[PDB]
Structure formats: C-alpha cells, structure tokens
Design a protein around this motif. Structure first.
Motif, PDB file in Angstrom:
ATOM      1  N   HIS A   3      33.432  21.844  52.832  1.00  0.00           N
ATOM      2  CA  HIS A   3      32.532  21.819  54.057  1.00  0.00           C
ATOM      3  C   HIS A   3      32.224  23.459  54.451  1.00  0.00           C
ATOM      4  N   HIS A   4      33.589  24.036  54.720  1.00  0.00           N
ATOM      5  CA  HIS A   4      33.679  25.341  55.154  1.00  0.00           C
ATOM      6  C   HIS A   4      32.893  26.284  54.059  1.00  0.00           C
ATOM      7  N   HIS A   5      32.651  27.510  54.397  1.00  0.00           N
ATOM      8  CA  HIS A   5      32.289  28.529  53.476  1.00  0.00           C
ATOM      9  C   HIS A   5      33.022  29.841  53.447  1.00  0.00           C
ATOM     10  N   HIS A   6      33.180  30.362  52.108  1.00  0.00           N
ATOM     11  CA  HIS A   6      34.099  31.426  51.775  1.00  0.00           C
ATOM     12  C   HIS A   6      33.028  32.717  51.391  1.00  0.00           C
ATOM     13  N   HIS A   7      33.459  33.880  51.687  1.00  0.00           N
ATOM     14  CA  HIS A   7      32.996  34.973  51.216  1.00  0.00           C
ATOM     15  C   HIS A   7      33.779  36.062  50.635  1.00  0.00           C
ATOM     16  N   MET A   8      34.439  36.785  51.445  1.00  0.00           N
ATOM     17  CA  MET A   8      35.399  37.644  51.184  1.00  0.00           C
ATOM     18  C   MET A   8      36.665  37.459  52.038  1.00  0.00           C
ATOM     19  N   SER A   9      37.881  38.102  51.568  1.00  0.00           N
ATOM     20  CA  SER A   9      39.216  38.206  52.138  1.00  0.00           C
ATOM     21  C   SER A   9      39.439  39.612  52.530  1.00  0.00           C
ATOM     22  N   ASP A  10      39.062  40.565  51.542  1.00  0.00           N
ATOM     23  CA  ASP A  10      39.632  41.879  51.605  1.00  0.00           C
ATOM     24  C   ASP A  10      40.889  42.135  52.166  1.00  0.00           C
ATOM     25  N   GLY A  11      41.785  42.225  51.250  1.00  0.00           N
ATOM     26  CA  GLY A  11      43.342  42.424  51.675  1.00  0.00           C
ATOM     27  C   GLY A  11      44.273  42.339  50.732  1.00  0.00           C
ATOM     28  N   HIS A  12      44.539  41.272  49.948  1.00  0.00           N
ATOM     29  CA  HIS A  12      45.403  41.445  48.784  1.00  0.00           C
ATOM     30  C   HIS A  12      44.627  41.209  47.587  1.00  0.00           C
ATOM     31  N   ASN A  13      45.128  41.987  46.567  1.00  0.00           N
ATOM     32  CA  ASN A  13      44.424  42.019  45.492  1.00  0.00           C
ATOM     33  C   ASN A  13      44.840  43.250  44.308  1.00  0.00           C
ATOM     34  N   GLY A  14      45.720  42.696  43.351  1.00  0.00           N
ATOM     35  CA  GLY A  14      46.320  43.323  42.442  1.00  0.00           C
ATOM     36  C   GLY A  14      45.336  43.611  41.299  1.00  0.00           C
ATOM     37  N   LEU A  15      45.908  44.450  40.319  1.00  0.00           N
ATOM     38  CA  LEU A  15      45.177  44.797  39.065  1.00  0.00           C
ATOM     39  C   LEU A  15      45.772  46.022  38.280  1.00  0.00           C
ATOM     40  N   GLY A  16      45.117  46.339  36.989  1.00  0.00           N
ATOM     41  CA  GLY A  16      45.593  47.309  36.300  1.00  0.00           C
ATOM     42  C   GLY A  16      46.018  48.603  37.014  1.00  0.00           C
ATOM     43  N   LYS A  17      47.240  48.497  37.288  1.00  0.00           N
ATOM     44  CA  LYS A  17      48.027  49.549  37.848  1.00  0.00           C
ATOM     45  C   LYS A  17      49.427  50.033  37.414  1.00  0.00           C
ATOM     46  N   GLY A  18      49.645  49.468  36.317  1.00  0.00           N
ATOM     47  CA  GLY A  18      50.831  49.793  35.530  1.00  0.00           C
ATOM     48  C   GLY A  18      50.956  50.029  34.101  1.00  0.00           C
ATOM     49  N   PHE A  19      49.466  49.871  33.425  1.00  0.00           N
ATOM     50  CA  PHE A  19      49.398  50.211  32.048  1.00  0.00           C
ATOM     51  C   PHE A  19      48.840  51.544  31.672  1.00  0.00           C
ATOM     52  N   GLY A  20      47.541  51.782  32.405  1.00  0.00           N
ATOM     53  CA  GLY A  20      46.803  53.008  32.360  1.00  0.00           C
ATOM     54  C   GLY A  20      46.536  53.605  33.578  1.00  0.00           C
ATOM     55  N   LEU A  57      50.600  47.796  26.756  1.00  0.00           N
ATOM     56  CA  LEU A  57      49.718  48.797  27.416  1.00  0.00           C
ATOM     57  C   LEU A  57      50.410  49.832  28.232  1.00  0.00           C
ATOM     58  N   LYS A  58      51.414  49.510  28.820  1.00  0.00           N
ATOM     59  CA  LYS A  58      52.114  50.650  29.692  1.00  0.00           C
ATOM     60  C   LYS A  58      52.507  51.789  28.666  1.00  0.00           C
ATOM     61  N   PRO A  59      53.187  51.648  27.645  1.00  0.00           N
ATOM     62  CA  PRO A  59      53.774  52.855  26.821  1.00  0.00           C
ATOM     63  C   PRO A  59      52.570  53.448  26.019  1.00  0.00           C
ATOM     64  N   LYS A  60      51.598  52.759  25.641  1.00  0.00           N
ATOM     65  CA  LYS A  60      50.726  53.207  24.668  1.00  0.00           C
ATOM     66  C   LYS A  60      49.295  53.204  25.567  1.00  0.00           C
ATOM     67  N   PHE A  61      48.947  52.307  26.161  1.00  0.00           N
ATOM     68  CA  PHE A  61      47.581  52.380  27.061  1.00  0.00           C
ATOM     69  C   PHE A  61      47.803  53.464  27.924  1.00  0.00           C
ATOM     70  N   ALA A  62      48.851  53.842  28.322  1.00  0.00           N
ATOM     71  CA  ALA A  62      49.222  54.876  29.252  1.00  0.00           C
ATOM     72  C   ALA A  62      48.550  56.034  28.924  1.00  0.00           C
ATOM     73  N   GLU A  63      48.430  56.152  27.554  1.00  0.00           N
ATOM     74  CA  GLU A  63      47.270  56.976  26.868  1.00  0.00           C
ATOM     75  C   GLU A  63      46.259  56.943  27.021  1.00  0.00           C
ATOM     76  N   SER A  64      45.617  56.107  27.965  1.00  0.00           N
ATOM     77  CA  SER A  64      44.291  55.665  28.452  1.00  0.00           C
ATOM     78  C   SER A  64      43.860  56.989  29.362  1.00  0.00           C
ATOM     79  N   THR A  65      44.438  57.825  29.266  1.00  0.00           N
ATOM     80  CA  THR A  65      44.465  59.031  30.398  1.00  0.00           C
ATOM     81  C   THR A  65      42.773  59.486  29.896  1.00  0.00           C
ATOM     82  N   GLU A  66      42.645  59.222  28.816  1.00  0.00           N
ATOM     83  CA  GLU A  66      41.117  59.702  28.079  1.00  0.00           C
ATOM     84  C   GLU A  66      40.363  58.549  28.425  1.00  0.00           C
ATOM     85  N   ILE A  67      40.846  57.263  28.474  1.00  0.00           N
ATOM     86  CA  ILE A  67      40.100  56.187  28.552  1.00  0.00           C
ATOM     87  C   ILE A  67      39.643  56.239  30.120  1.00  0.00           C
TER      88      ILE A  67
END
Length: 157
Positions: A3-20, A57-67
């Motif tokens: 019934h209700h409608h949803h668009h965005m929450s903007d607040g909590h959202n994790g992601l690639g922050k421990g690999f590269g 990815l953490k130890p190797k993808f950490a190499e993603s510095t170029e990526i």
C-alpha cells in the motif's frame, strides 16, 4: 508493494571498504549518474555467508590501488545481507549466496557477464583481484556501448 510507497532511506549502507577501496562498490549513485554520460556498465559484486571473495581481495585486491583509478572504465556495486535485493541481482545463473554479477548500465543484473577466469562450476564466484581485474579490463571495452552483444542484430543485404 502492499500500500505504502518507498523511495530512499539514506543512512545505513555498507560496501567494499575492506578489500581495495573504491571499485565494485562506488555505488549506483555515482556509478549511474556517470554511467549515463560516459556510458559504462556496472559490476554488482555481492557476497553472503562466510564469503571468500572478500577475504582474498583484502590482501591481494588491496593491490587495487591502481584499480582505484582504472575505475574510469566503468563502475560497480557491492551489497550484502544488509540490503539483499529480491531478484537475480544477487544470483542469476547459480544458487550460491551471493556472488559477483555483471549488469547493464542502469542496474539490470543479467547472467550475461561472469568471471571466465573463475572456476568451471561457479563463474560469478570471485577469489582474487587478478581475475576481477581481467574481467574489468575486458568487459570494460565490450560490455560498454553494447559492444559485447556479438556485433549486430540484423541487416539483410
């Protein structure tokens, strides 16, 4: 939808922050807004339960510095149980929980692009920056601008 409608929450959202750093998680916000002009597809990498594509990815993808700069080729997104969608966006041509998924510029996951360098019974499964980088440096030329769909669709002449 109920019934209700949803668009965005903007607040909590994790992601690639421990690999590269900033790669398969740049976010659809900056990835889409930019994927429209330059015209570049996305690489939605998702990982659930244990997940090895994140630890390796953490130890190797950490190499993603170029990526981190190579991203000029396109933009990807990394999601987890925190924001697990309700479709193939997490697992299209497989049953794992969840793996890497390449999709069209807009956020339309499709089992069209996998990790050819992956295993012969997982594909989307990732476990090294070496492969994700070849699939990055590759699909970035064909997957972008519809240059991956063979060539043409029709003509007759």
């Amino acid at each position: 939808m109920h019934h209700h409608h949803h668009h965005m929450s903007d607040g909590h959202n994790g992601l690639g922050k421990g690999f590269g750093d900033h790669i398969h998680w740049r976010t659809l916000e900056d990835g889409k807004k930019e994927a429209a002009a330059s015209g570049l597809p996305l690489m939605v990498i998702i990982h659930k339960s244990w997940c090895g594509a994140c630890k390796a990815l953490k130890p190797k993808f950490a190499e993603s510095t170029e990526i981190s700069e190579l991203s000029h080729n396109f933009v990807m997104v990394n999601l987890e149980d925190e924001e697990e969608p309700k479709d193939e966006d997490f697992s299209p041509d497989g049953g794992y929980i969840p793996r890497i998924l390449f999709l069209d510029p807009s956020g339309k996951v499709h089992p069209e692009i996998i990790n050819e360098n992956g295993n012969p019974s997982y594909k989307y499964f990732y476990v090294s920056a070496e492969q994700v980088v070849q699939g990055m440096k590759e699909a970035q030329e064909r997957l972008t601008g519809d240059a991956f769909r063979k060539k043409h669709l029709e003509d007759e002449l």
